[PDB]
Amino acid sequence: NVLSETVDQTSPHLSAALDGVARFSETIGKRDEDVKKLLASANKVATVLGDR
Amino acid sequence: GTLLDEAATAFGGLGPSLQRLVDSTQAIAGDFRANIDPVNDIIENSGPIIDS
Amino acid sequence: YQDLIGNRYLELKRGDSDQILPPGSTIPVERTEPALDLDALVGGFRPLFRSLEPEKVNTIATSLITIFQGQGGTINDILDQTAQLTASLADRDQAIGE
Amino acid sequence: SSAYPTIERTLAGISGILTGGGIPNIEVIQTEVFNILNGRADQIREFLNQLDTFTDELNQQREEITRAIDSTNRLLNIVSQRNDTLDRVLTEFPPLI
Amino acid sequence: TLFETITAISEQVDPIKLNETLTAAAQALDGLGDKFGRSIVDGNAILADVN
Amino acid sequence: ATASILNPSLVASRVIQLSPPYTGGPTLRDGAVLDVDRTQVPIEYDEVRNQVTRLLADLGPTPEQPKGPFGDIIESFADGFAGKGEQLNRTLRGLSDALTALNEGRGDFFAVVKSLALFVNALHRSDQQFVALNNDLAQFTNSFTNTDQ
């Protein structure tokens, strides 16, 4: 019963959340290699900054 | 029948995809809790220099 | 099945095509099916009955009651706020890429 | 005119569901759900509440987040179009310093 | 009547879609169900520290 | 060994089976006593009837809930996800891709977090000195750019 009423209550607010999450997730998903290279270069630069 | 059709559409071939999702989620959350202290330090001390 | 004792019989269905099958021809395996095979039916219940262990069922039930009781408004707020924030973030897709 | 499903047909349908339906997976799923919910119900509930608060706080700063993204985009565009100057600086200033 | 009702449900079950759905769900968390709960606890701590 | 009473079929003579087969080691000696802990009993037909009746009454339809718990949950899940299958699939694929991308660079990202934490923790105490530095630098440069040449 709890699951039934939870789904009945949260259903109208789910489509917009799914759409927004999908779009924002794809924003990084379509640039995976760029993001990973950015993280590696940022690791090098931030290590240089922190050590000094 | 409708629920089974929707579940098949949503969970067609996402076996490895959802496996990677859950594994990445747990790894990121664990490492974030491990490094929460640097995160707190950044959050609390970045404001002074930037506002300066 | 003719009965539950072990008697069988062969059933023929006409189909739709009007092309008469010449005498002596053989119906292929592509349109023939076996009987119940009661042993397979009984053995298929083994995982279903093994998945009904009372400990796991009760633990999951109590945990779901604890987690999702009166949390409809909280989950609605989570969904609305994350929808708005993610839509605003995705409106800057080109900016994020640049 | 019609006919009731015989016991054989009903059991054959159930057997088809059991054998072709991937039933052996269900138990595994349940087991994993157990491992998710084993003594962590209250913690998951308070996590839902904290996630609600955190998401509200982040959503209240969406305009500032967009403005920061735009500003960083502009600055990084200018720096990227002066990347040649950056290279020429990093090639010859460190020896002087 | 009982056989007719069970047959009516069985015709709607459509075991192929059920099979693929259950296979995806079982592969989703096949070896990490304790990991997901531990991650939820860790995220609870992180949110308690960040909020 | 465990002496379990078995009922082979619907109408049969019940037997006692020593369930674990012998593979070596110490053996059961004459005059041994098996307690209730190491014995088993069949399920009986009346227990099956009672459990079936109990589950059907408890989890079945009620005047308050005409469709029952399972009917209500399947109705709510069918209505609550009607048309959201493609959206949910797209959301899950995007989330998996993004989270995998973050997880592959997770070590580098948290190295960034630690290094920036060191940097900010060592530089945050001098915010006013930084403002003074910028103002003094502006004045010092103004000291040489009063005219164009």
Contacts with C51 from chain D: Cβ below 8 Å = 26-27, 30
Mutate to test the interface with F, among B17, B32, B33, B51 (most CBs of F within 10 A): B17
d(CA D60, CA C84): 10
The answer to whether D30 and C51 have CB atoms below 8 angstroms apart is yes
Q: F50 to chain A, minimum CA–CA distance in Å?
A: 25
Which residue among B8, B11, B49 sits closest to F124, beta carbon to beta carbon?
Answer: B49
Cross-chain residue pair C88–D66, CB shorter than 8 Å: yes
Indicate which technique resolved this structure. Answer: cryo-EM
For the sheet with F39-40, list strands across it: F15-18, F3-6, F39-40
Cross-chain residue pair C83–A19, CB shorter than 8 Å: yes
d(CA A40, CA A34): 10
- Identity at F101, one-letter amino acid code: A
Contacts with D16 from chain E: Cβ below 8 Å = 10, 15
Number of neighbours of residue D89 by Cβ within 10 angstroms:
11
Resolution of this structure in Å:
2.8
B4, containing H or E segment: helix B2-10
Q: B18 to chain E, minimum CA–CA distance in Å?
A: 5
Contacts with F85 from chain A: Cβ below 8 Å = none
d(CA B28, CA B21): 11
First to last CA, chain F: 107
The answer to whether B2 and F74 have CB atoms below 8 angstroms apart is no
Q: Give the torsion through C-alpha atoms of D15, D20, D24, D28, to 10 deg.
A: -130
Count Cβ atoms within 10 A of the Cβ of residue F44 and give its class: 0-12 exposed, 13-18 middle, 19 or more buried. exposed
Sign of CA dihedral C55, C58, C64, C67: negative
Asked if B16 has any chain E CB less than 8 Å from its own CB, the reply is yes
Contacts with F75 from chain A: Cβ below 8 Å = 4
The answer to whether F91 and B16 have CB atoms below 8 angstroms apart is no
Contacts with E44 from chain D: Cβ below 8 Å = 43-44, 46-47, 50
CA distances from F68 to C57, F60, F146 (A): 18, 5, 87
Classify strands F3-6 and F15-18 as parallel, antiparallel or unpaired. Answer: antiparallel
* Residue of chain B whose Cα is closest to the Cα of E19: B8
